C-alpha cells in the first residue's frame, strides 16, 4: 500500500546528519512534499534554532549535499525565526516570528514576503509548548491535503488545537479543538487528517474527519528526546531533530 491510512507502526530512526555545533542541538529539517520549481523532491532545507536572532535557512540542491553539511545557499529571513515549528510548503518556509503568534509566508527561490497572519487566539514563547520546551507552542504542519497549524489557546485550557490553513494567505479555514494537553506531549504531526502525538509511543490520535479521538501505543525509538518531529506526506516518512541529530523514520499506514 502507497497511498493513505492510519498509522500503525514507527521505524528506528535513521541519523542523515550531525549538526556540529551546540547553535544546532535543535532545530528543523525537512523538504517539500509539493517543490516548486526549480526545487524538487531532493531539496532540504535547515535551521539551527538555538540563540535569539534565528535567520539563516541553509538550503541543499542535493541530498548528498545536506549529509555533508555544505549549503548551496543560504536565505536570511527579514525577520527572526521562533523555534522549531517551521515547514516547507509549496515553494514557501512557513516560520513563526520571534516573540510573536504571527506566522510568516517566505517565498524561499524569489527571497520574498507573501503573508504574515496572527493565529487567533494561539499562545506563543512559553505559553503552550511541547513537553520539553524550546518555546514550541506553534507547530506548523504538512499532510496529503496541505498547510496546517498546531497550537493551544486559553480557551482551550491549553488542549491541542489544530487548524488547516490557506498556503497562499494564511487564513484559519477550519479548526478543530482535541481533548490532549499540548504540554504533556513531546510533538505532535498530522498523517491524512489524524493528528498524531509523540509521549515513548505514539500515544493519541485525533481524526479531523471524524472528531474522534483514540489511545494509542505505537513504539517510538528515540535516536536520544526529539526536539521536532514533523510528517512528510510525499515521502510518507517522519522527519525528526534528536539532540544535534537530523533523523528520519521510516513508517508503516493501513488503510
Ligand atoms: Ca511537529
Ligand atoms: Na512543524
Given at each position: 500500500?502507497?497511498?493513505?491510512?492510519?498509522?500503525?507502526?514507527?521505524?528506528?530512526?535513521?541519523?542523515?546528519?550531525?549538526?556540529?555545533?551546540?547553535?544546532g542541538?535543535?532545530?528543523?529539517?525537512?523538504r517539500?512534499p509539493?517543490?516548486?520549481?526549480?526545487?524538487?523532491?531532493?531539496?532540504?532545507?535547515?535551521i539551527?534554532?538555538?540563540?535569539?536572532?534565528?535567520?539563516?535557512?541553509?538550503?541543499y540542491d542535493?541530498?548528498?549535499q545536506?549529509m555533508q553539511?555544505?549549503?548551496?545557499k543560504?536565505?536570511?529571513?527579514?525577520?527572526?525565526?521562533?523555534?522549531?515549528?517551521?515547514?516547507?510548503?509549496?515553494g514557501?518556509?512557513?516560520?513563526?516570528?520571534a516573540?510573536?503568534?504571527?506566522?510568516?509566508?517566505?517565498?524561499?527561490?524569489?527571497?520574498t514576503?507573501?503573508?504574515?497572519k496572527?493565529?487567533?487566539?494561539?499562545?506563543?514563547?512559553?505559553?503552550?509548548?511541547?513537553?520539553?520546551?524550546?518555546?514550541?507552542?506553534?507547530?506548523?504542519?504538512?499532510?496529503?491535503?496541505?498547510?496546517?497549524?498546531?497550537?493551544?489557546?486559553?480557551?482551550?485550557?491549553?488542549?491541542?488545537?489544530?487548524?488547516k490553513?490557506?498556503?497562499?494567505?494564511?487564513?484559519?479555514?477550519?479548526?478543530?479543538?482535541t481533548?490532549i494537553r499540548?504540554?504533556?506531549?513531546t510533538?505532535?504531526f498530522?498523517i491524512?487528517?489524524t493528528?498524531?502525538?509523540?509521549?515513548?509511543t505514539?500515544?493519541?490520535?485525533?481524526?479531523?474527519?471524524?472528531?474522534?479521538?483514540?489511545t494509542?501505543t505505537?513504539?517510538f525509538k528515540?535516536?536520544?528526546?526529539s526536539?521536532?518531529?514533523?510528517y512528510?506526506?510525499?515521502?510518507?516518512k517522519?522527519?525528526?531533530?534528536?539532540?544535534?541529530?537530523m533523523?528520519?523514520?521510516?513508517?508503516?499506514?493501513?488503510?
Amino acid at each position: 500500500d502507497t497511498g493513505c491510512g492510519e498509522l500503525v507502526w514507527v521505524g528506528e530512526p535513521l541519523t542523515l546528519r550531525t549538526a556540529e555545533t551546540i547553535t544546532g542541538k535543535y532545530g528543523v529539517w525537512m523538504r517539500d512534499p509539493k517543490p516548486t520549481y526549480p526545487y524538487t523532491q531532493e531539496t532540504t532545507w535547515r535551521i539551527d534554532t538555538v540563540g535569539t536572532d534565528v535567520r539563516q535557512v541553509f538550503e541543499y540542491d542535493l541530498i548528498s549535499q545536506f549529509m555533508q553539511g555544505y549549503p548551496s545557499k543560504v536565505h536570511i529571513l527579514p525577520r527572526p525565526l521562533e523555534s522549531t515549528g517551521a515547514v516547507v510548503y509549496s515553494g514557501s518556509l512557513y516560520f513563526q516570528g520571534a516573540e510573536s503568534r504571527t506566522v510568516i509566508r517566505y517565498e524561499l527561490n524569489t527571497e520574498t514576503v507573501k503573508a504574515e497572519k496572527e493565529i487567533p487566539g494561539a499562545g506563543y514563547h512559553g505559553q503552550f509548548p511541547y513537553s520539553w520546551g524550546g518555546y514550541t507552542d506553534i507547530d506548523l504542519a504538512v499532510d496529503e491535503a496541505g498547510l496546517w497549524v498546531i497550537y493551544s489557546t486559553d480557551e482551550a485550557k491549553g488542549a491541542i488545537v489544530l487548524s488547516k490553513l490557506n498556503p497562499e494567505n494564511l487564513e484559519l479555514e477550519q479548526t478543530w479543538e482535541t481533548n490532549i494537553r499540548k504540554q504533556s506531549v513531546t510533538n505532535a504531526f498530522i498523517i491524512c487528517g489524524t493528528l498524531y502525538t509523540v509521549s515513548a509511543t505514539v500515544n493519541f490520535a485525533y481524526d479531523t474527519g471524524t472528531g474522534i479521538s483514540k489511545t494509542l501505543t505505537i513504539p517510538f525509538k528515540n535516536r536520544y528526546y526529539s526536539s521536532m518531529i514533523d510528517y512528510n506526506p510525499l515521502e510518507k516518512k517522519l522527519f525528526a531533530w534528536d539532540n544535534l541529530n537530523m533523523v528520519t523514520y521510516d513508517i508503516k499506514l493501513s488503510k
